[PDB]
Design a protein around this ligand. Sequence first.
Ligand SMILES: *[C@@H]1O[C@H](C)[C@@H](NC(C)=O)[C@H](O)[C@H]1NC(C)=O
Ligand SMILES: *OP(=O)(O)OC[C@H](O)CO
Length: 161
Amino acid sequence: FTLIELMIVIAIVGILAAVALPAYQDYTARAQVSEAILLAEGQKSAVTEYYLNHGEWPGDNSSAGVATSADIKGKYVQSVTVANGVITAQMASSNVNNEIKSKKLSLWAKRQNGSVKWFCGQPVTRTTATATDVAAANGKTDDKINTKHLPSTCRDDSSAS
Ligand SMILES: *[C@@H]1O[C@H](C)[C@@H](NC(C)=O)[C@H](O)[C@H]1NC(C)=O
Ligand SMILES: *OP(=O)(O)OC[C@H](O)CO
């Protein structure tokens, strides 16, 4: 070899050092959102029990049997709220992935004739406790967890049934 080869390998070392990284933030965000998925799944039993014994979805955390929304918190989850049978888990505002800062995801259920289908994904809103349909939460600001920061199994739409 010669000096040109050594300069070329130095340039290649620089290329490798300054190589672009994949969107590992998305995967870390998925891992952190898994915590809120588990926390929202925790309240599924209470919400389902109230719906079965009363015929209408739990309007608030109070009659769902679950604690206050601020109390249902984890390392990366700041709140898990139940609104008309829809379990919405909100991320933390700091010490979390920047992609999922202060973002929410919903875990709602639809009662079929033979089962109670459970759907997980972007935030949804049920108007009344007796309503059998859900709709997207609101535009407002970016409170929706991006679908790339959610598991592929947790990307259900508001129209899913
Ligand atoms: C529990 O959620 C119910 C949906 C609600 N009923 C109505 C008609 O709003 C009820 O008031 C709640 N109970 C408590 C103790 O908050
Ligand atoms: O009522 P909830 O437990 O959803 O908490 C309200 C507060 O503004 C942050 O969640």
